[PDB]
Amino acid sequence: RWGGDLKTILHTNMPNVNEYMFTSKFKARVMVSRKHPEGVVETDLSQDKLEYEWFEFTLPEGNFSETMTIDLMNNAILENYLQVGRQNGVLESDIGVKFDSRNFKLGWDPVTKLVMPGVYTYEAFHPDVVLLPGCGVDFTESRLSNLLGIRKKQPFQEGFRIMYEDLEGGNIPALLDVPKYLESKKKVEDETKNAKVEVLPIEKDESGRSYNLIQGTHDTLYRSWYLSYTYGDPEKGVQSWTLLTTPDVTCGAEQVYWSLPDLMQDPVTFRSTQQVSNYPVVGAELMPFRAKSFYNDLAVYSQLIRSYTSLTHVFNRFPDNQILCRPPAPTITTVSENV
């Protein structure tokens, strides 16, 4: 009885995002059409029927540098937005789904329940999602969740669907407008002493896009998954069934199985099937694909430079809106390498 001491040399080169390995082709659910209320005031009040249709989105292959990928996906909802919505009347402030990385509750103050500074701190913390009511995302087939830094707590039960009602516990706080607060502070203090300041959330940005803040409250109809995870109920939030993890461009490292079919005798419980798929495996290894951690402080500063060099704003179509702006680059990330 003869035995062989198998040795194998493997070398591969996989693009970070591709149709295979399901690293591309994620699926979401966005607004498709916003009907007008017939016989009602148009600009005075815009509440009316809304529709939501599931769509599957695709990314161009080979776009590495996950800072790009999170951006490219955003670019795609905007593509769809464009076509379908524009034609059917959805607002541009109602994109619904957007991928970001900011910590929208960073400058939050418990007493005023408002973000005091007036801008959301542009420092990247971790990729997440921002969802309008009635919209959601899916990652059941596509493996972009691993890149997104979101992993399901109980993996086996099927379906990684994220819905607006699921992210219960975290809503993006509104922003205090700097001039109004400063005007009241200077006026009231100087006038009262020589001879109660009020705080107002920002209704909308400069371009006219509406932040759609909740009337009577300092929140908005935007539920950030990151906020729900940390600042939320551990049982009534995503903390119960969703786990935070470090994003990796490699999108995991599956195992490869080496089978030589007609040389090595089949292992214990394998039978000789000439199916293309099934062959008697002989060894198992991780793919030569692996992720190398890379770090540089000037990630945000470098991002601004790329905006000028690229000489186009396809990736920053909404500079005015703060919550719809371009997400910040992450200070520490990974770059895939083949060994």
């Binding site: 700097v178 109660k196 300041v197 705080v199």
Partner: peptide
Amino acid sequence: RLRVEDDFNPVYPYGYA
């Protein structure tokens, strides 16, 4: 709206760095 007291102190250098 919300009315804070006379000497409410948000701790962000606000006017200028």
